[PDB]
Amino acid sequence: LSEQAETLEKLLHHDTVYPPGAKVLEAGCGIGAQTVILAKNNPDAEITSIDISPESLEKARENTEKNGIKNVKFLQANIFSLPFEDSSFDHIFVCFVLEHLQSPEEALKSLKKVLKPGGTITVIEGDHGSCYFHPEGKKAIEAWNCLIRVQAYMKGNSLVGRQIYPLLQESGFEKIRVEPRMVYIDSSKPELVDGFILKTIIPMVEGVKEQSLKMQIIKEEEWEKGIEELHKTAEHGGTFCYTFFKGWGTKEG
Amino acid sequence: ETLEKLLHHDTVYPPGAKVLEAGCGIGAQTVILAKNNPDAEITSIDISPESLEKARENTEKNGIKNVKFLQANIFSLPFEDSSFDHIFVCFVLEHLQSPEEALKSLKKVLKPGGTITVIEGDHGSCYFHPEGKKAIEAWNCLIRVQAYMKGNSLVGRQIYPLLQESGFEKIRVEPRMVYIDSSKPELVDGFILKTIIPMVEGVKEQSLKMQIIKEEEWEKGIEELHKTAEHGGTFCYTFFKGWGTK
């Protein structure tokens, strides 16, 4: 999972560099894939990483420890009711968090509380609705859509990326800017073909096979055909596209 | 504007370059190409004399002096082989059932070491917020109708393999995305309101005749498309730009 994070490093996180001595809050560190990258790009920042899962935090700590990181503090917490004092952070970093929520706006308003006036929030989310490829295998398309359907069933929204601007806008932030960060692949980019299609996309779809089979939204046969068709996009003649959205907002004072 | 700059800002050839614009149509891109390259010798072709007449009026209206409009067929060009320094293709492959062969044909009149530039949209890259089910259905009618007419509105994503199969070298393809939110009123109006919606409405008659959608559904879909251009709405469409060298 961490290797997949580095595959998109230059594209998504390279420009996320805060000034020296900045107190930053990572809204959802999970297993620490983003924690390691954020910390390495910001050795002079004081990072506080939170997650609702105790298990995950333990793994995140293991990850930062193995990577020699010394500027990160871990804490279990509910994003909707932070234990932190108001206006106690210089910046907030949100990456792949809103996709798992039902009330994203509320989470952003909650985070805004612990951010100081003049501080910024950075949001990075994917948008599964931006995924298209060639050849356009219909089974491959059906398999992919299972990921969207399962996430929705689990009360999340894999299509959140496209609405980060209005989410930030309704959250009360100012000087908002959102821009897409696209992953475009063809056979002349073997590193992305293997790193993104074969080691990120396909494994991610496979991750919901049994759940999809149980929800009975697809058959074991077409599912297998769908995986085979996805593989074709990583071969001669194939192309693949996926877009992420990155937004910035500033707390008004 | 931003679309003009997004797609054409980097297409600037050396002074005096002999450039062939494959299918100029009504001259919409001809004007941009000519203004960006005042010293180029532009030859703009199209299969239709009527389109060429409208293109001429367009360039004259803009005081352009370096464009010659010629009636020609991509599959049987009149030009000597290896006579152009560069070839420019924009929104042409989407209407061809055999784009690969069209590129091979064009390669013939291109000089060794010359380049071809291709720009095509990809209707399959289009998504928006709110995600109206009817808006999506109406948008898919555009894709379905063009496919029935033996074109391919999803050709953009294929520029790389098309250029590769046609024998070009030093190939490069990059996306040129149109991302819109309420903080970009110029794109909301110019792209969503004046480009997207009119294009969809352009296939209403054929869609109803093909019975792929009902009048009721259609009217509601147009209404939902308008929601993407209102407060809280966002819109995304991607174009693909490729370059190849003979």
Automatic annotation (TrEMBL), chain A:
Domain Methyltransferase stretches: 21-128
GO biological process: methylation
The keyword Hydrolase appears for this protein: no
SUPFAM superfamilies: S-adenosyl-L-methionine-dependent methyltransferases
Keyword Transmembrane helix: no
InterPro entries: Methyltranfer_dom, SAM-dependent_MTases_sf
UniProt-listed Enzyme Commission number(s): 2.1.1.-
CDD domains attached to this UniProt entry: AdoMet_MTases
Pfam families xrefs: Methyltransf_31
Keywords assigned by UniProt, alphabetized: Methyltransferase, Transferase
GO molecular function per UniProt: methyltransferase activity
Name assigned to this protein: Methyltransferase
Organism: Methanosarcina mazei (strain ATCC BAA-159 / DSM 3647 / Goe1 / Go1 / JCM 11833 / OCM 88) (Methanosarcina frisia)
Biological classification of the source: Archaea, Methanobacteriati, Methanobacteriota, Stenosarchaea group, Methanomicrobia
